[PDB]
Design a protein around this ligand. Structure first.
Ligand SMILES: *C(=O)[C@H](C[C@@H]1CCNC1=O)NC(=O)[C@H](CC1CCCCC1)NC(=O)c1cc2ccccc2[nH]1
Ligand SMILES: *C(=O)[C@H](C[C@@H]1CCNC1=O)NC(=O)[C@H](CC1CCCCC1)NC(=O)c1cc2ccccc2[nH]1
Lengths: 300, 298
């Protein structure tokens, strides 16, 4: 099952940011509030905004930052790629130990969906190979963030900016760089064709083996190159060296070499499951990372 | 459309660790009382069959080690309410939220904050199965983890975790210490009643699938409530009541699909299967979204 990180450390950082008639969410860490720069757009600014031009016209006193209904005075503003950084006069006492990280396709994170700076829910998301996420975002959710937690340290990896016509979502890291080829303009953008996250399917197969469900283990092995060429014919992502590395602990725990599991997956792709199931499912699951499998089987 | 849990922050501030002898689990710290499963007072030999009121009278306040973070809380009182131990401590929890203890109905959902050694580990949504189990994700040391709902900053606690059945499903109590279902806190292999599928929830989730733009399972047919219930019972689905039909009112208005029209679609899905197709990414009929859950998210 999909399990989110406890969200309390991020809840204490959510604020709302209003510029004109547009209110969205911001992330208050120390004395800086981070939010999508498109908060400074008017409804006619959105087709092709000149953000440098739009920001020159704005002053500190045009930005309404509120924790609940308590206003935080803005004392400075700047733009870093597609995120606005608003310096405020109060350091957030609830600021956790944190870092800003850019995740790879296939990595998962928890999203704290927020509206008017107020947390509404938390759920686990995977960054697809086409750099969209299947979020659950409504109007006003922009500036909601995705994160992982590692031993008290919150790693922020996603800030929400927009929905594509297909209903999936696109956003930036916390340095304002979009994931994938998207831009913050209200134009016809489409997610490129998605693929299956191979490293996560392998993680899921390791999880099946750990639980005693191992009929798919075969007597074959493969090279990484050979497997990658076949996997791409089935709309599976090629494996990287980092992928092989993050499967290391699961490979060690089960004694099944990563390339042996690749050969097992290759057989499943070429032959199907034959009505058999894996972990009580006819579909290969691709939204659990090796860390998710480990985290779910340990009390971290 | 995803499975969404409530933000856990208000609950995380209440989780503590409770130790008795060689047994460690989680407790819920509300004002000056810590609530935890009473089986913390069992020794390994006691767990076999425990006379709890007898085992508890033999315990002293100092037998209970309670830790909040690095701080240790002094137990100044202890009492039992059914299967829940209540440890009075000398410090009120300053992070205590507005809260209520509620006993939920089969079919209703709640968020679980899974904790280990008093520290929160993950949050996820669960439903009370019709047979009063929950399909959780709990490991050793998760006992005392709680399930809850949040309504306008009031936390309604509804579940406290006690055990894992041999089938891997889970069993626990409300916060008054009464088990959901026929289960008992003795270390014995316990089977649940035969589970059934939560019908009103499957329908809410079908409506959710419509709101998000997939309609391949809809049909032109309709059905009566009684004829649908005959087919549902044949497939081990719970009965659909008129109250359920009314509760689905808003979703039917939103999509313009009468409830009995959607029942006919589910009848078709049950009798013909999903032909290898999928709904909202799932190959099976999902029954852990309530009408409220779907409304709140859509
Ligand atoms: C921010 O709160 C919202 C989040 C959206 C709203 C509904 N569900 C979401 O995830 N963001 C937007 O509404 C953006 C605003 C634009 C302002 C200028 C720069 C680009 C973002 N717009 C969209 O998300 C959007 C535009 C668009 C055009 C044509 C079809 C679909 C579509 N979606
Ligand atoms: C508390 O932390 C654990 C949570 C379990 C452990 C593994 N996964 C879980 O959810 N609770 C237990 O281990 C209880 C211990 C007490 C139960 C009540 C009376 C005293 C012991 N036991 C079980 O969960 C358990 C015992 C048992 C015996 C035979 C078959 C299955 C079985 N499950």
């Amino acid at each position: 099952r999909k399990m989110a990180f406890p969200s309390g450390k991020v809840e204490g950082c959510m604020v709302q940011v209003t510029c004109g008639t547009t209110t969205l969410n911001g992330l208050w860490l120390d004395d800086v509030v981070y939010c999508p720069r498109h908060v400074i757009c008017t409804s006619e600014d959105m087709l092709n905004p000149n953000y440098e031009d739009l920001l020159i016209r704005k002053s500190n006193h045009n930005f309404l930052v509120q924790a609940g209904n308590v206003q935080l005075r803005v004392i400075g503003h700047s733009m870093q790629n597609c995120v606005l950084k608003l310096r405020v006069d109060t350091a957030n006492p609830k600021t956790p130990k944190y870092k800003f990280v850019r995740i790879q396709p296939g990595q998962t994170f928890s999203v704290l969906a927020c509206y008017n700076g107020s947390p509404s829910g938390v759920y686990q998301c995977a960054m697809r190979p086409n750099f969209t996420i299947k979020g659950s975002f409504l109007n006003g959710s922009c500036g909601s963030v995705g994160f992982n937690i590692d031993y008290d340290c919150v790693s922020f990896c996603y800030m929400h900016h927009m929905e594509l016509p297909t209903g999936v979502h696109a956003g930036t890291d916390l340095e304002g760089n979009f994931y994938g080829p998207f831009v913050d303009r209200q134009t016809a953008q489409a997610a490129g064709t998605d693929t299956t996250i191979t490293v996560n399917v392998l993680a899921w197969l390791y999880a099946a083996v750990i639980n005693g469900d191992r009929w798919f283990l075969n007597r074959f092995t493969t090279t990484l190159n050979d497997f990658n060429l076949v996997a791409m014919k089935y709309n599976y992502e090629p494996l990287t060296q980092d992928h092989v590395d993050i499967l290391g602990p699961l490979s060690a725990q089960t004694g099944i070499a990563v390339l042996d599991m690749c050969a097992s997956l290759k057989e499943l792709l070429q032959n199907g499951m034959n009505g058999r199931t894996i972990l009580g499912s006819a579909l290969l699951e691709d939204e659990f990372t090796p860390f998710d499998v480990v985290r779910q089987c340990s009390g971290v």
